[PDB]
Amino acid sequence: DIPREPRRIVIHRGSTGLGFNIVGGEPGEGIFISFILAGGPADLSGELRKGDQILSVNGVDLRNASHEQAAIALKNAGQTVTIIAQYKPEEYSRFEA
After folding, report:
1. d(CA 65, CA 27)
2. Which secondary-structure segment (H or E) carries 93?
3. Residues 11 and 19 sit within 8 Å (Cβ to Cβ)
4. CA angle in degrees (0–180, nearest 5) for 53-55-59
5. Residues 6+ apart with CB under 8 A from 71
6. How far are the Cα atoms of 8, 26, 34 from residue 48, in angstroms, in the given order?
7. Which candidate, 44, 14, 32, 30, places its Cα nearest to that of 87?
8. Domains in the chain: how many in total?
9. What is the DSSP string of 17-81?
10. What is the rounded distance in angstroms from the CA atom of residue 2 to the CA atom of residue 33?
11. How far is CA 38 from the centre of its chain?
12. Which domain holds residue 4?
C-alpha cells in the first residue's frame, strides 16, 4: 500500500498544468488532491494519489492554505515543482460528495 509518511514528489508542468485538481476551503481545512488526469504529469509519476494532502510546494507551506492560496501557489511554482504529499483519505473524504 501507499506510504502514510510525507512523500517528496517532483512534477514537470505540461500542457495540462500539473495534471491534478485540488480541493480545499478556508485556511486550516487543508489542501487535497481531488482528481488526477490520466496520462498527465501527475499520473506519469505513479506517485500522487487522490486523497493526498499537499503539505508544501517548492518549500511553500500549504498546511493552513485556503483553496485560493494553494491554487495561486501551484500556478506560480514554475515549470518543475516539488510537492510534499501525505496520503489522508479519511480527511479528504469529507470533501467528496
Report:
1. 5
2. helix 89-93
3. yes
4. 150
5. 22
6. 10, 23, 11
7. 32
8. 1
9. BTSEEEE--STTS--EEEEE-TTSHHHHTS---TTEEEEEETTEE-TT--HHHHHHHHHTS-SEE
10. 15
11. 15
12. 1-97
Tracing cell 516539488 back to the chain, one arrives at 82
What technique was this entry resolved by?
Answer: X-ray
Type of residue found at 9: I
Query: Which residue is listed with cell 506519469?
Result: 44
**Rounded Cα–Cα distance for residues 27 and 43 (Å):** 27
State how far the alpha carbon of 53 is from the alpha carbons of 15, 31, 50, 64, in Å. 23, 6, 9, 11
At position 97, the amino acid (one-letter code) is A
Q: Which amino acid is at 17?
A: G
